């Protein structure tokens, strides 16, 4: 029996009591139901209401049929879908847009089209798996187009319009399966040369100058003299090059993408947010892909055509996502012969591509290769510390270091920015172990594997030269100048240091584990396989004095200034009188200073961000560098006030020198003599703050009834709970290995330190560091000697073998 | 004009060129649509699909329909709503359960009531604010109910019926205005007592022996025998104090409740999934209470009915967030007397709630107070150390620290757990500071306030002392004993000590800033203003002392004990042999161990989470543990082997004794001499690891066209970007202020540490420690004194004054 609920929705409070019995008795609802005249007004409103349908509505029900698609439920995507399209094609006469109107009458009739599609695979006509909306690309004109542009030949439909369409495809290994192609492909076009610029979160400056120097390195390439030894022939001749090159703009995400990015886009015809808008409404896409041929005017002079295919995506990941698409998909259905990887900012000199391809060309043994990496205008601004400093390092790191590794064929690291490779040598494996991660959860890999995160580089490099049965090497060209931009503060240069150090510590680990690969599996000549012996040496010499250099600086600093002040050790002044307080005060406030400073430093790198903490790494740094200047000249005034011996020039000259010597014999002096100073004060600071901020961060890295409906409720609950475990259980391990290799590392440092200044004096130790010192130098000089040697001899050399 | 666009969908891959001229010409489109045919399949066969409705699929229109609603969107609200109600009502008479069609066929009624008010509205004939679904509370038969139970009286309606209502409150406040009702004010009775039980993620024997401890203490008053002067009267006499108690259970979230405490709570007659799941379908509640008069049965006892009310909240928030929803909605409508505050799993003893009333009705210048909370089955399992140090820290602070701050009618933290309040001294701004966090959000705050988290107790119990125009001060009653539940290993208790320590720390801080208030506003005795003034000073003192107790206590265990062996002045032997290493190796020892423990365990604490660094902790304890038992042995061994002074004798009482002397005092010695021991071997460990962990973690806390489409788009995505700026910008802030706390902390202990022991003596430093410890225990020895003295001699001299 119903009790008196007729007005129970409309009144602010009622309470009733709903017995479980024997259900309701019938003839009783429908009394109920016939006696209420109020639903007849509603019905009628809501009618009335929903005669008019609006665009918003219509998207909002396909994005709704893409979700249900999604979760494989197939007549309610039916429906939702019918009612998307009739909608969007009642709306479609209303707008006044032209552009607007053509755009949803296509995609109702798309959409009307996939559901008879549909219809037909549910009754059974169609026997298909996994079906999916049919893929549809829409070439519109572009907004923007110069009429006073002049260029080598463009048709038409080529130079006027841009063509867009959305990709589902959830692995890119399945990119050319689905039946996506590209504009190249489809007008017969063979590029041989692709070149990779990731983007996330930038200016348009930066992809203006992006843009204006790949423009003009192909202009370069064009203006090639024919009939020249030094000429590169083929497919990379003149007036024709612009059409065998072909470059992939890959975003990183809709959300983080800078607004005026977005505009400069759409001004040069690759972005328009109507056609995103519309044609992606019910496809659930994961990326969203358009294609032009662009053409750029600087100042008076037009550029060259550049065929452009811009892919965005809808969600946010990481680089090594956007490698993923780029190199899977695009490479493996194009299949050029190079592929040149690139970040935004890039900007390259004119030389750059035609001296890689003629590597490349030439030496025919080559699996990868990358330039040199300059910063943009060092000689500018040139009272920046910071600046001044990285600039020193980059240009010494590249000479010696790239030189050495260069001589053996065997590149540690691929810079990521303006390197790189055939698709011939990384086509299988090598690009298999690359992208593991992305393709196997980081719970079966480990948290050894899982830490190496940002050290893909080195990864595909010691894969390219260890696959089996090829022989591949890597090699560095000189001439291949790239200008970057760096940091102008200590913070950012902080935050940017984590994942170098990072990567760089887990993939040596990784490449010292694996170097039996080679001889093992890979398929090298004898002498090859000798120096890759002697290289492992040296590299494992390299790496543990490495692993000890805060205690090195350490006691190197104690010893030779504080107990030379002490001990009457100092040359240039005596220390004989004084009242033996002022003897022990030097070195007492040294080591208060010295464990004050590291031990504040680790607290805060442990700790928190380092973009609140400026002013402490700031403070931390100056004190750093001002005890690392006073050490430097009390060190110059000890050299030259002792008379001076044989052992004694050697010494230094194998010490210090060599960067000198070998700048000298690059040419590239002047740098040098301007940035040593700069250098010098900031050793200290870049050891100790960065190792210790790199170890510290380690962990950061990426129809049913009711009893059918209660059954879902709870099993979707018992999923999220166990999601939610594994998460936890994954950090928690990601956690403690990254805290027992600080501890390790830590203590390590403080305990050789300590034996070595209780046990040990400075006569009996400071001789084995001279010694350890100047054996690495000397590696280092001898391996930039033999490069020197190589590009200048080899090429007119090759002619006799 | 169109292309050929007939088969795009179908297709896997079409090309098409939609030209943007000047819209397709008009009476070709209707061509192309009646042209095709299997649009009158397709739409055949979903007409045939959406003939027969699904629960589910009601359900899931409706949930639309309180979002579209919450959005302030009403047509579409009001469309949504009419689809699910008359969804509803045809599904109701398929279902063969009477109670799932019975409460179907109710919900349906009630929608399209609602849908009818909705309509007037939206037509202007009714003029209301943010209309909403009326309240409707449905009471339905209990699935269990036990013929063989023997109760006082019950009426059938009240015995046999479970009462359910969902409420959408989202400020608590309006809980009355809104209209909601509580079955006790509607049966008419008005309880004069209200117990909070919060619950989260909890097994069904904590809640079932809360429950059953509730029950027992019910019966205790209820056997309470009349014409007594120590008997209560009035509201809690007997045969009748069942009426005047009601008990709410306050849930956490449904997500994280543990599914066998909610198969418990159906057994018992308080939760249905079923009615839960219908009721709450287009409402959208905040909340979902349950109540009913439950009727317990242990073993052949049948316990006496308690009115319960359980309050289940649909998300997840924090325990001051259920303490809000429980004071303001629940007090704020009945109004009661006083207001008692537990958790799940404190068991209490018969007499507890007996004593609290007594105080509070004898005493009656009482606003608020708190019971002893001990620790169950400390004999048991008396191996494990940890249990009976935590046995013996309990038991000492309520001795000392909670009767001398009784002595002074100011008790600086209630527990929390089993507390009790008045509801007349904590109405108006207590509790509005009380839940200034959940009314401001953080970053108008500040870090200093919203770091102050978990310390919310401290908060209450200072506003309602310094409470303006009032003269309200705390008791603690001792015989009020409740029986807590501990960790049973080191890494649980790490865990649990950092929410106690930080919210120790700050609330402290904020008590000593603001106990100015107690003279400028409040209004109490000269004679009460004076004694907050020694107590005041009292409080500086002890909390000076304890914010240098790491370095105090590595100064006393250094200078005693290694610098006894090394400079010969232990007495139970002679040093003065030996060849001089020994002498330096054990200090050298020591301070090696010292600070290597303490850089492993800074590491550690601001590094990773407790729970996987397991073995560490523990070795760290056992070090210290080991290093303290060898310290005491020694020097027990060093004052036994002095022949004793006046100065020795009376510093070793009030140092040691005192513990001692104040537990025979009041009975509870047996317990001291058990865990002295244990409590011993943790002092290190307590100290440094507890307050390390603590300050490391400080940061853990909480119609339209096309253009209006994309300027909503573009707003959403704007609002988005700032909303994590602000998040950013806010735990930045955070971040900072717990870094720069934790250095001036570790610093200012380092610092002092080092000086007084390079430019200080033993025997100038050891007398002043000497001092500061016998002063402080001889005040705390004094307060335990009173306490007792007050509480067993004002009851028999209460006549005279
Ligand atoms: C630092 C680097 C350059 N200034 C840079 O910042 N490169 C970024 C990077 O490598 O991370 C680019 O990576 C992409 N990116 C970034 C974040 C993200 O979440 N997703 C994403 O795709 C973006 O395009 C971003 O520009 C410089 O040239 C350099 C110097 C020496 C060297 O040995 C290597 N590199
Ligand atoms: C530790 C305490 C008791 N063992 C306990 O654990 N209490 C919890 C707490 O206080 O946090 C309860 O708080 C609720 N809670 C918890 C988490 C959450 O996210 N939400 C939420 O509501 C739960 O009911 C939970 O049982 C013990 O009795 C005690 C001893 C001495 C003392 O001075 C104070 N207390």
Known sequence: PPPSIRSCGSQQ??????????????????????????????????????????????????????????????RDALKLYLEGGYAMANVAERQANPKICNLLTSKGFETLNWCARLCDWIEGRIKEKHPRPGVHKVGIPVSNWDEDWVGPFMDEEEARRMWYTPVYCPHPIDFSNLGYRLRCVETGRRPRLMICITMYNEGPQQLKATLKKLANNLAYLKEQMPGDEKSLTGAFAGDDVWQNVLVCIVADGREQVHPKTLDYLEAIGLYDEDLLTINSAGIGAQCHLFEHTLQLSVNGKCLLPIQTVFALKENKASKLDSHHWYFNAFAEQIQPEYTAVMDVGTMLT???????????????????????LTVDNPFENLSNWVISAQHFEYKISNILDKSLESCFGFISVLPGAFSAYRYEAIRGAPLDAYFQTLNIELDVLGPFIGNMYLAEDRILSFEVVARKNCNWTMHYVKDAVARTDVPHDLVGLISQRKRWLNGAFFATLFSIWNWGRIYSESKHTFVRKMAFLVFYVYHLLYTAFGFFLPANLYLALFFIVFQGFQQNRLEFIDTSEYSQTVLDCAVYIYNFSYLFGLLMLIIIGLGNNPKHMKLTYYFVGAVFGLMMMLSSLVGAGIFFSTPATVHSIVVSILTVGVYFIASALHGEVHHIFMTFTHYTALIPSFVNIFTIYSFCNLQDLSKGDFKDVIAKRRALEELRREEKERVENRKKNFEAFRTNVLLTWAFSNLIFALFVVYFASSSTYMPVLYIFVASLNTCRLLGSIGHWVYIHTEGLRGRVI
């Open 13 to 74: 409070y009622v309470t009733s009591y709903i017995p479980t019995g024997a259900a309701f008795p019938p003839s009783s609802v429908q009394d109920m139901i016939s006696s209420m005249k109020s639903y007849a007004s509603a019905t009628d409103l809501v009618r009335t209401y929903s005669e008019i349908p609006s665009v918003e509505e219509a998207l909002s029900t396909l994005d709704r049929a893409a979700a249900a698609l999604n979760a494989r439920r197939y």
């Open 350 to 372: 004119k030389s750059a591509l035609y001296h890689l391809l003629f590597a490349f060309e030439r030496n025919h043994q080559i699996g990868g290769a990358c330039g040199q």
